[PDB]
Amino acid sequence: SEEAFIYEAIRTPRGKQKNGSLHEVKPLSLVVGLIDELRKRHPDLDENLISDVILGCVSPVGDQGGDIARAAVLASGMPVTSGGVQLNRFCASGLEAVNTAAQKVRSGWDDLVLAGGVESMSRVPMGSDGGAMGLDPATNYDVMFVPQSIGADLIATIEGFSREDVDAYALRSQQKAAEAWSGGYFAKSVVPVRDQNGLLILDHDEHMRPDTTKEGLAKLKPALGGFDDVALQKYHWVEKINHVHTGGNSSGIVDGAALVMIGSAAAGKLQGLTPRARIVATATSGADPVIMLTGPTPATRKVLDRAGLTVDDIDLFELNEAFASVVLKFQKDLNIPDEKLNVNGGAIAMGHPLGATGAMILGTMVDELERRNARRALITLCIGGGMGVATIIERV
Amino acid sequence: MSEEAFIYEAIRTPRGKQKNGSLHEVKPLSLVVGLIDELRKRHPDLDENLISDVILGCVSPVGDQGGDIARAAVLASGMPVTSGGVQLNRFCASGLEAVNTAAQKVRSGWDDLVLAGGVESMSRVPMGSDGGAMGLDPATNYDVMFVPQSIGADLIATIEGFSREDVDAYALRSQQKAAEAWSGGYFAKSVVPVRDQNGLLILDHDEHMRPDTTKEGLAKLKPALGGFDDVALQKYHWVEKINHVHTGGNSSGIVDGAALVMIGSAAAGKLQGLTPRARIVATATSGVIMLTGPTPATRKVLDRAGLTVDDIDLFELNEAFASVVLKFQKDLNIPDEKLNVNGGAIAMGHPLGATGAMILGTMVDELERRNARRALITLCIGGGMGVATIIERV
Amino acid sequence: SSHHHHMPDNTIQWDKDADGIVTLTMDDPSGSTNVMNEAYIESMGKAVDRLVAEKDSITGVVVASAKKTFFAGGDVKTMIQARPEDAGDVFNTVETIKRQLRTLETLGKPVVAAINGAALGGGLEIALACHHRIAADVKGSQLGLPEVTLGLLPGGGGVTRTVRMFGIQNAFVSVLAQGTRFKPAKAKEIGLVDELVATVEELVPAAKAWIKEELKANPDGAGVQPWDKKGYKMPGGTPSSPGLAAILPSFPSNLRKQLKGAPMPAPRAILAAAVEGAQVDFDTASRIESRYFASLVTGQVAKNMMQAFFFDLQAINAGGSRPEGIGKTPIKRIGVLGAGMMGAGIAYVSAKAGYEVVLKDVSLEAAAKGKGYSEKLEAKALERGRTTQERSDALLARITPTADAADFKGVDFVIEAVFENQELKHKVFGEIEDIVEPNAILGSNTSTLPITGLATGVKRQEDFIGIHFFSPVDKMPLVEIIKGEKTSDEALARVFDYTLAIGKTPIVVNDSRGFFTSRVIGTFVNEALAMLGEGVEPASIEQAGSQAGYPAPPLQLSDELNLELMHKIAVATRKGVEDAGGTYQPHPAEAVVEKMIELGRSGRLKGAGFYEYADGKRSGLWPGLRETFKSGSSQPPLQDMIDRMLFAEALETQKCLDEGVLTSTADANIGSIMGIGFPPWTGGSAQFIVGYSGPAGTGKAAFVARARELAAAYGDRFLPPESLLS
Numbered sequence A: 001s002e003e004a005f006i007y008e009a010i011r012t013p014r015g016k017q018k019n020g021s022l023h024e025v026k027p028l029s030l031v032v033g034l035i036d037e038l039r040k041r042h043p044d045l046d047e048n049l050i051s052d053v054i055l056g057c058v059s060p061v062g063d064q065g066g067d068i069a070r071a072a073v074l075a076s077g078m079p080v081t082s083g084g085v086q087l088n089r090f091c092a093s094g095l096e097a098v099n100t101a102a103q104k105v106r107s108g109w110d111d112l113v114l115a116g117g118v119e120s121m122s123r124v125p126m127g128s129d130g131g132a133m134g135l136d137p138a139t140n141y142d143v144m145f146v147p148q149s150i151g152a153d154l155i156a157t158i159e160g161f162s163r164e165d166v167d168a169y170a171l172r173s174q175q176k177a178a179e180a181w182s183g184g185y186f187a188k189s190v191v192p193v194r195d196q197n198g199l200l201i202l203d204h205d206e207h208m209r210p211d212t213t214k215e216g217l218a219k220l221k222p223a224l225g226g227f228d229d230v231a232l233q234k235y236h237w238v239e240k241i242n243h244v245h246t247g248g249n250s251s252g253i254v255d256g257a258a259l260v261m262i263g264s265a266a267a268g269k270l271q272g273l274t275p276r277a278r279i280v281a282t283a284t285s286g287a288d289p290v291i292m293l294t295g296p297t298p299a300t301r302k303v304l305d306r307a308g309l310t311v312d313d314i315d316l317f318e319l320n321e322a323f324a325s326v327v328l329k330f331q332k333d334l335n336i337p338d339e340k341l342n343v344n345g346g347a348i349a350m351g352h353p354l355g356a357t358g359a360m361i362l363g364t365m366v367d368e369l370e371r372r373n374a375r376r377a378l379i380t381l382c383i384g385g386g387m388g389v390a391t392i393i394e395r396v
Numbered sequence B: 001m002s003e004e005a006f007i008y009e010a011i012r013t014p015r016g017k018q019k020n021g022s023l024h025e026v027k028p029l030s031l032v033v034g035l036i037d038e039l040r041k042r043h044p045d046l047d048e049n050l051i052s053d054v055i056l057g058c059v060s061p062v063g064d065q066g067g068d069i070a071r072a073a074v075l076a077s078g079m080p081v082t083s084g085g086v087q088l089n090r091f092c093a094s095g096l097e098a099v100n101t102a103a104q105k106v107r108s109g110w111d112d113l114v115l116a117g118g119v120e121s122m123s124r125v126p127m128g129s130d131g132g133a134m135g136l137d138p139a140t141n142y143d144v145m146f147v148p149q150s151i152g153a154d155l156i157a158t159i160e161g162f163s164r165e166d167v168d169a170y171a172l173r174s175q176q177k178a179a180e181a182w183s184g185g186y187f188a189k190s191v192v193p194v195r196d197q198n199g200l201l202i203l204d205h206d207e208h209m210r211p212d213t214t215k216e217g218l219a220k221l222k223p224a225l226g227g228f229d230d231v232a233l234q235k236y237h238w239v240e241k242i243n244h245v246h247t248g249g250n251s252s253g254i255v256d257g258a259a260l261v262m263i264g265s266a267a268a269g270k271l272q273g274l275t276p277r278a279r280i281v282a283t284a285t286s287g288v289i290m291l292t293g294p295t296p297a298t299r300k301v302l303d304r305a306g307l308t309v310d311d312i313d314l315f316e317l318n319e320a321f322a323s324v325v326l327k328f329q330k331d332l333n334i335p336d337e338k339l340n341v342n343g344g345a346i347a348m349g350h351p352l353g354a355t356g357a358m359i360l361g362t363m364v365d366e367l368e369r370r371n372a373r374r375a376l377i378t379l380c381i382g383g384g385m386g387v388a389t390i391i392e393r394v
Numbered sequence C: 001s002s003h004h005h006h007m008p009d010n011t012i013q014w015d016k017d018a019d020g021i022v023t024l025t026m027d028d029p030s031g032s033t034n035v036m037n038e039a040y041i042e043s044m045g046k047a048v049d050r051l052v053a054e055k056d057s058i059t060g061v062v063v064a065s066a067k068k069t070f071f072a073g074g075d076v077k078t079m080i081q082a083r084p085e086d087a088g089d090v091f092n093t094v095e096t097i098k099r100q101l102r103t104l105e106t107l108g109k110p111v112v113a114a115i116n117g118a119a120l121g122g123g124l125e126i127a128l129a130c131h132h133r134i135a136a137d138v139k140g141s142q143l144g145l146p147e148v149t150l151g152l153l154p155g156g157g158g159v160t161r162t163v164r165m166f167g168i169q170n171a172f173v174s175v176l177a178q179g180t181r182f183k184p185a186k187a188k189e190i191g192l193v194d195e196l197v198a199t200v201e202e203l204v205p206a207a208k209a210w211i212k213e214e215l216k217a218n219p220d221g222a223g224v225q226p227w228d229k230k231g232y233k234m235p236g237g238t239p240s241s242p243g244l245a246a247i248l249p250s251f252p253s254n255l256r257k258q259l260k261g262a263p264m265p266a267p268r269a270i271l272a273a274a275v276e277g278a279q280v281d282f283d284t285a286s287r288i289e290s291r292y293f294a295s296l297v298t299g300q301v302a303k304n305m306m307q308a309f310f311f312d313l314q315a316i317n318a319g320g321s322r323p324e325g326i327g328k329t330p331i332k333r334i335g336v337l338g339a340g341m342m343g344a345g346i347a348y349v350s351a352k353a354g355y356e357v358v359l360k361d362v363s364l365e366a367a368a369k370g371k372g373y374s375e376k377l378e379a380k381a382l383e384r385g386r387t388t389q390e391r392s393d394a395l396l397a398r399i400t401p402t403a404d405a406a407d408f409k410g411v412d413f414v415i416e417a418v419f420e421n422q423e424l425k426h427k428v429f430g431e432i433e434d435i436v437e438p439n440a441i442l443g444s445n446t447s448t449l450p451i452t453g454l455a456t457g458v459k460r461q462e463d464f465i466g467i468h469f470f471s472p473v474d475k476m477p478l479v480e481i482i483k484g485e486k487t488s489d490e491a492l493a494r495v496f497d498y499t500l501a502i503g504k505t506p507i508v509v510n511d512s513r514g515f516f517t518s519r520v521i522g523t524f525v526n527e528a529l530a531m532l533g534e535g536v537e538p539a540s541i542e543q544a545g546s547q548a549g550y551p552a553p554p555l556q557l558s559d560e561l562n563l564e565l566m567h568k569i570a571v572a573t574r575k576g577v578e579d580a581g582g583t584y585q586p587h588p589a590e591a592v593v594e595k596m597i598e599l600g601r602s603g604r605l606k607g608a609g610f611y612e613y614a615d616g617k618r619s620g621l622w623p624g625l626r627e628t629f630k631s632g633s634s635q636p637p638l639q640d641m642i643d644r645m646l647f648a649e650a651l652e653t654q655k656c657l658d659e660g661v662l663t664s665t666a667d668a669n670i671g672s673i674m675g676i677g678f679p680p681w682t683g684g685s686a687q688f689i690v691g692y693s694g695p696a697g698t699g700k701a702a703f704v705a706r707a708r709e710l711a712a713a714y715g716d717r718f719l720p721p722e723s724l725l726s
């Protein structure tokens, strides 16, 4: 019944892994800083109307353990009634938090919800939380666990994506991320990180290499034994995996956080909030878990049928650039026009902070829909274990 | 706010005790897989491709419980790879928040059939194993005056005036009702025995229960780090001394367990041939002393469903601490014959991430055994949170 | 809980001396070897009960044996009968065994194992329960946990204790995963044994001496294992340790890479029990190990491997196919005709046993190249420390290369290994038959040509026989003895005894075209080439062979066999039925071989076949292969490709068992396993029939059903024979 609207969508800059500016910043501080920015934009916002804070986090241990969403509610002085819940659906945790916030508003049992994600990979590396699919030999031996890297190389092999093909996309991502920054596209959405004294720590995406060349990408070397033979035991018609993915055509390991304010139409009226976009539909699906990175394609199909739309009804497509082959396969499968796909760059140039990425690229499309005065955008991410989440937003 | 969400199945494992427990050798992933196989056994023709998500609550998602335990369950059990899988943590009410999130996914129309529940093997992954953003940041821990749940419960008993014999009287009541519920066969079809890879029995009862508890034995127990008592009284400055009345015999037990709930739309139930057992009427979320969160969450869920206390037939509040239940009973004048009628966590245990779904399935069964209409389930939470849910028998 | 389970003679002798040291002397009076049977369990239960009752007058314990071996193996005759409904009994039995060893391990006083001989499986598990292990360095003594070779796991604490001693990785790779056997010197090198003695008479004295010093020097830690002390640190860390958890997810994938995806559950269960046990206390780890053991014993693969590698392999060594009523006959000089890869390996394994070998070829340069095969095998043996400089000289000195037929004087055992051709074999035998001893065995290493025909080229046909080796001879354990129509029983027993002398396993085959190994391996390769002609992807065919459990994929093997030789076998098979007025149905693989020969890709020897070979090294499949056979036009389920290769060999074994080519299922199972590489998890090409398991069921009836299903889809060659019906 109730329609979920996006009122605010902000994010931190993405600090790089080695000698990154955000390494000295606890992941809790990254979220609190975004909360304070929302207050600056709406000083008379009745925070008592906020019923939940939903944060995606893939490695909820150490600095990110103990329900970091509740920690942000308490540390930022929000009312103790604002809840706080952490969730983990691997790469699409940030987008699942936004969709869960939207589905909470649609059910009529929640009126105004904050959602997003946070990941400080330089302080909490991925895999720090352990896991059963890797550290239980009985179930690991059965499900044939294979890292996302080999699965991405397997996709390039089957589809015929050469080393030059994936590197060509990686260059395109660098060029479009540079044009977006130099063009001021991110001026209002990227909230610079500062210390307790107000000193600047980071105000831009450190991982970007705007002077990338195809010759430089071709010099990079491609990314524990056994995983290569295990993948071919299932995909038995393939003789050899062509390893095309490097650090230059795969997503970057960065730190960052993102926040989205979602509420009903009546909630926006009571608080003087102008809606920016509307959540049209959300969907979840998946494909094989040995190759993975293939769940978003049927999730995109599922979210289109549910909203009664087709590819030609969508103005912008945003797929997380975990690996270049996954995006190129997604483009071939649905015949996505090149000028509609990741128009402001992606995680290859700017980084992939796991639990926050989904909310970041979601906020990116909200801004690009307004800047272009376009109508609809589709946001989707590939997921480990073979999952996929998709969302359609409509400009308001 | 259109599609109605129904409960089709609600099962749980027995709860194994912390010291020399039968479930210590069982990985928490296997506790969930065992419940999934039980659902298959009860519906051998269920098209699992209709299941769109598996939502598991887990407070310590590290070690054997890390890496999205819900996705591990989907893959390990052989469920369709399109069934998703997500872990969430909202402290004690994670199991109920997973059920509520599953119900809200069905109401939005964007999901048809969802598995929901929780898992916590506390004898393998103890509470606090995941660390915490508050404990690892003294600047935040200093400003946000942090006091453990144990002391806030003692503070509630001090302010409300609950004596050591008052809280121990409730602990005796819980042990007696839990033993009566087991002897009467109330849990025969909802507690699924845990077995090994050969079919041998591992556990089939809540081995934390002490059905021979006496008032004298509870009085001999001793009450459960420095600073936290002074930090609490810095906030509640009108209180002189905190009366420590909570022991291990009137507090929730540390146990291992899991629970699964199948939630779906009316169309999904008809399509798969499933009988709806109850209907999700409403959910709500609101809330240094902690544990005072479920009182506004209960009023909010009653106000949201257009009901009062007199409309509810059964009240189920998690027995984290005896004083928390006694305050809840006093704040809302809950009749004694309606409050935790089959015992609670003091007798059977509190497996954190799974408790919310366990006590929900307990009320689905007791509503049908009594042929009653409505029930209310709520859990207190650390940090000051609270979740409540109203179900109606179909 | 008791030390007893639920009549048998006592196994353990009790002896307490004046110092208070109790000596438990294991001596089962119902056999020459101490075995972990129901008599032992009851005996050790009474002994352990007595140690507890008399604890106040006991200062130490010495576990000893009165046999030539210390303690070897368990009760296979009982384990092979355990049904899935018996999982509770099997669990209780191994729990009672480990409850006895745990009590002995925690008596508060030192326990020393005096290992006088072989301590294998349950025998080593008893010694591992002791606080100190002393081994006598004698000939033939071995130590290890070879339970995995029977499809089992060390369920008497072997997994739990070796992991506590060496860590997860070292225990799995070096001890558990493959059941490696160690000589006493190597056992101490890796920590499996603490000290050595020169003879068995020093053991019990040294055991009591160690107890006396341990009580005096280490009074607080006496009788306390390292994993029972506070502050115990597992070597390599626990799964929660950050260093081990970095590589731990790669352990199952590395295991799946080594096993090539073959369906053998025992290594998987050992790895799971090892890791799961390292996450909990010792007792809980021990109970987890029990459940994984009961999982394997009640399974079918363990029954297959117990049948093949215990019962069948014993019956063969006991002279099952050896003619009864024939005495021993010595061998003094062996003469090998031909210095190829086969003839050189035959000369090596014969001289390594201790025989004097005369290696004849047509030129001295060729015979010298044959001995160079032995010299290069001794060079690799010295560089890795597996032999001495003196034994290598005595080995090579027994090999006398030559090029003259006169050097075959005094030879009483001839083994011909020339090129596969009847006229060439008739020629080289007539030259030397009058120069060898009048009772000399005239053997032939032919693989397909019938023996009865080759025996006509000599006068002493009663001593002509087929002695079929397998390349490489130095590493292949089977010898296929083919009995011609004129071959006597004495010649059969003499070749039988020779096979055991060189350390190889024999099978006896009646004369026929292709014998048994060459004929059955023909159906396996033919099925792969048939699938290639049908349009199945070559990579899928190779995957099906590896995942079925074969040591080498079938297309790769086809190149090592040469398609030119493969075509000649088919032409001889057709001519062997056409010249009898019979009917011959060509295999679909024949058309594939002919087209590859036409294309000049006849195998590895040519330099090109189904694979590409650059500098004598295989380097990927031939890219033109997919366009030649329309690869991809047929995509059957992988299990169909696997079953087609397994069932073809199983059905051919049944034929040549009904035709009388084979005389026992033991020869069929061990012959298929050790001869041509039939997957060991099946238990052999004959055991595969009685142990098949699929969606239909388990047993001979399930095999017949699946075979009829394959026949309806892929051809009447999969129709089950009459002998398999009721």
Ligand SMILES: O=S(=O)(O)c1cccnc1
Residues within 6 Å of the ligand: A157, A158, A159, A237, A238, A239, A240, A241, C539
């Ligand atoms: O490795 S193969 O040569 O089998 C292959 C398979 C599929 C697509 N390109 C190449």
Ligand SMILES: O=S(=O)(O)c1cccnc1
Residues within 6 Å of the ligand: B158, B159, B160, B161, B238, B239, B240, B241, B242
């Ligand atoms: O005496 S105290 O200040 O601890 C107290 C006692 C009962 C209720 N409120 C406060």
Ligand SMILES: O=S(=O)(O)c1cccnc1
Residues within 6 Å of the ligand: C072, C073, C074, C120, C121, C122, C123, C145, C146, C147, C148, C150
């Ligand atoms: O049963 S055991 O695995 O101990 C064994 C012992 C001796 C030879 N084969 C197997």
Ligand SMILES: O=S(=O)(O)c1cccnc1
Residues within 6 Å of the ligand: C172, C173, C177, C178, C254, C255, C258, C259, C267
């Ligand atoms: O994983 S290992 O490389 O130790 C292994 C295991 C079983 C057989 N061969 C090798």
Ligand SMILES: O=S(=O)(O)c1cccnc1
Residues within 6 Å of the ligand: C585, C586, C587, C588, C714, C715, C716, C717, C718
């Ligand atoms: O199944 S048979 O081996 O009889 C066969 C079938 C088709 C072509 N040649 C032979």
